[model samples]
Target chain A: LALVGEKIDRNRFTGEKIENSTFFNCDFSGADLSGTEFIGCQFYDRESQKGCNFSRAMLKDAIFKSCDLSMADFRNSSALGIEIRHCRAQGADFRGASFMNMITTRTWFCSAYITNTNLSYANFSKVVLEKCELWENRWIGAQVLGATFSGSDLSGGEFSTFDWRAANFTHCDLTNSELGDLDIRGVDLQGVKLDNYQASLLMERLGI
Target chain B: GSHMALALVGEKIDRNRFTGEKIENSTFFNCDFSGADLSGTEFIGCQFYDRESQKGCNFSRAMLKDAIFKSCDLSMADFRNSSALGIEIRHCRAQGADFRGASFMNMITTRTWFCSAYITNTNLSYANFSKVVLEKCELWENRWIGAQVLGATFSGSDLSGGEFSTFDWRAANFTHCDLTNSELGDLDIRGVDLQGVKLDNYQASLLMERLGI
Candidate 1:
């Protein structure tokens, strides 16, 4: 079915798996294609792929507008010029994915998992990423301005060159994270859980 | 100590290949990254997209006054974040690109072909597009106050929702473009190109009010 700018309401296929399909500019607004698989497929605002299992997908200039992608799994996906606007991506797994040139606004990825991912050179403003786990991921050269990271586990994150001055990190755990390059007073760190390693590093500056 | 934005104008980029490379916290002036594949490259904190950006490049906080881009393909290039005045883009082919949150004063574009480009949440306060070739672009929710458009082609663009207050749409092309969910009565569409552009009935009626009924 050639779907371009068409409104897809519901789906009869229980997480129908589509492979090697080029779905461009198709608005799958409220379609539930859960547990589906995609490879090298392009989805522009087809944000209704709830619980969709995506790995190794090529997305360019793709956008997800106000779709409830709460349980989407983006493990091992690489994208460029992708925009995520108000999509609820709670509990998403983004293992080893490279999302560069991205603009994420007001999206929620609470309790998500990211590892060694390339998330640099993007603007993640006003996004909700609380209680997430990110390790060895890249956030340098990107703007995490006004973003929420409450109760998140961002240990071992590459923030040595990142400027997270205006981000909200309330009750977050940044143990073993490389935030030495940044000034501790720049960001809001109320109730943040800092381990021994991070405290000692900061204590050096406070050597009184 | 490296918080200083490097100002390297008239410097031939013979040392830095800048291919898939990331350089940030620097300002480039009169630097040419010509004939280099600058895919996924980032230049932040008073950045400058080089004149001859052969392939794609990423520029967050930018300054482009002494530069000229001609005959280049900037696909999926990210030009986000702006903290300066006097930006310029001229004579290029950029499709499927992203320009988010780029504000400008004394900003302008000329002879640039930007098809399927996306400029979201950006404020074009002093933006002027004269003789620009823009088609199939997605300009969503931008601050279009005091923007000037002259002789630019915007066919097949999707300006779905925007504020057109004080927008002088004088002598520009919006043929087959979608200006849906927007109020255009505050704009000056005199001598503008609106042929085949898709507008809501409210907008069409508003345009007639300016067209002498």
Candidate 2:
């Protein structure tokens, strides 16, 4: 179902299997939708079911595996080395994107909208990011573990050399975030809503 | 409000408060609410049916993680070794349930009702069993990776050593199902309803050498 400003130029598809398709205002810029296998697909838009542009899109290594991209919109996409596995992306939108080197598993980013996204070449594990709005995103060498991040809006985020663990941060709003080289060991920061210089810079990187 | 576990006959207690009540069989029947704080609780139907009263309703090996069950009956509930990440059983009514070795991620079992269920060694990855109602379910060594399984029904199911990978089976309902030693790879079986499906003999020697596609 690829009609409406359609242009699948320079196609080099591999294992392409896009089921239940629907792509509006389409134009696969530089089009090499790599290893594309989008099941139950609905690359949204036209009614702001958001997912309209791919401006300067060269989606390197694109593999949106197991897709159900709920309300998709890769805002301002370049999507470098993309590989979002186990997708069920709710309200997705990576703003001001550079979106470098991505990777994911057990994905279901509920209400996601990574503000000012650079992604610093992403990473994830057993994820279920709820209410996400990762502001100012760019966690160099990002990593996560057994997750359940609730009410997330990591205000002004940027964690240098990250490796979060056993996460279940409920009601999060890491105000003015930039956790000095984060590694919240075995984290489950309950009712997290840090303020006070981001709770004294996350207890001086968890040495509190 | 104090209850150190006792009261299986027509049960409902503490005006609202219960805990670690483990009594597997013999009138106790697996009722460990794990420090119960059940939100908006209700368990309509079969409170007690006296066959020694307490077989159905055993949250076998229970620890309903991230629980949020709405509208329940739990007909024969007994989910052994549960692994429902962020679990939320919606519009539930478990019929003959006994999910052997269960495991799931992002579980939001919408419109649930396992008709004749008993998933042997289950492990549903990236799961969201939508509109589930496995009419005559029974799968062995099950592991459905990348599952969405919209409007599932498997009308009269039975899968030997099951593994439905990369699943999406749109409008699913494998009528008269029974796929021995099953393993359907890269499954999209679009609008699947393989009528009278029962392919054993290793898919009956590839459906008899494709004598006719």
Candidate 3:
């Protein structure tokens, strides 16, 4: 089904299996998509490169498997407990995609599962993704400047051409990952778990 | 203090003439003792080098087993192809000495060899020890600046409390060596086997700083 410029606010899409669907420029604001499974779905039009709007949407327990979400707008969306596996999310803007639950303005906690995904050239600047399951992802050329990824499972990740000093990665599990240009002198790696091979590689940079 | 002032200038010493002899407080200026058997000989307070003429003695192909050269000035001396097993050369000024082809080893068989030497508290700057095996020897507290030790193996040797400026640590096997309290200049630790090597706490911190830890 191809949905173009459609308003689908407050719509119920729970436990639905959507396949090969195009949602170009469609509005899914305040919609309920809990437990919905999207396979081979395209949120952005390939020819025009335009994406659908998912602002203020309820995407709890939604599974985006094998989907193309390039250039998609997910600003201010409640994506708590969502899973985006084996998907391409290149250049997708997630500036306000809050997997957060606020008890007050001062107290908040985040939760998300985004594994085995290609997030190349994605804009996640200044976002808070603390204590999340973000393992086995390819993050090449992803813009994560000023982002907080503390206490996250970033193991088995490929971070080629990525700047590690730009983000907060303390208490993270970074085993079996490609850590390009991760200088140990400048970055704080408190409670970080790296394998013995990775530790030797880091020491080799100083010719030791 | 029995001092013998026998100063011989440019003399050709006879071979096997000083075997097991005790020569004390003597001076030999520009002497040539090549192929001499000076085994078990003790020379205390000897001046074998004359700085006025800038000339030194030649002891090439000499048998120097169990020999003692205490408080000697042997600067610019040639000790090539000498059998120096169980030799002691303490408190000596041996600067620019050539020790090439010298053997501190005692061969029980063709394949089995053991070495013994005690050469401490000496000035050995610009000395040549290329391809020499002085393993498990006491070589401590020496001034070894600008020394040439290419292909030398000083494994299990006590090389502590020495000055090692301009020395290349990668050109030799230094495993199991005691290098504590030494001035190690620009010693890179990359791809080198440093097993059982001893270093001081300050040297350990300096190596860690090279790794930016």
Which digits, one per residue and each the tens of the lDDT, describe model 3 over residues A50-102? Answer: 87777777787888988888776777777887999888888877778788768
Model 1 Cα RMSD, Å? Answer: 29.3
Best by TM-score: 3
lDDT for B36 in candidate 1 is 38
Alpha-carbon deviation at A96 in model 3, angstroms: 17
Q: Report the lDDT tens digits of candidate 1 across residue range B53-82.
A: 433444444443222232233333445553
TM-scores of chain B, in order: 0.49, 0.33, 0.94
Best by lDDT: 3
CA displacement after TM-score superposition, residue B161 of candidate 1 (Å): 2.4
lDDT of 2 by residue, B1-213 (tens): 222223464343342353322221133333443223433332222231233544555454454444444344454555655543334443344444554544433334555433333444445554444555555655555566665557656577676566776766554676767766777664322224455665554454332122111
TM-score ranking of the models: 3, 1, 2
Candidate 1 chain B least-lDDT 10 residues:
B82-91
Candidate 2's C-alpha runs over 4 A off are: A1-208, B1-7, B13-22, B26-63, B66-75, B78-170, B173-180, B183-201, B204-213
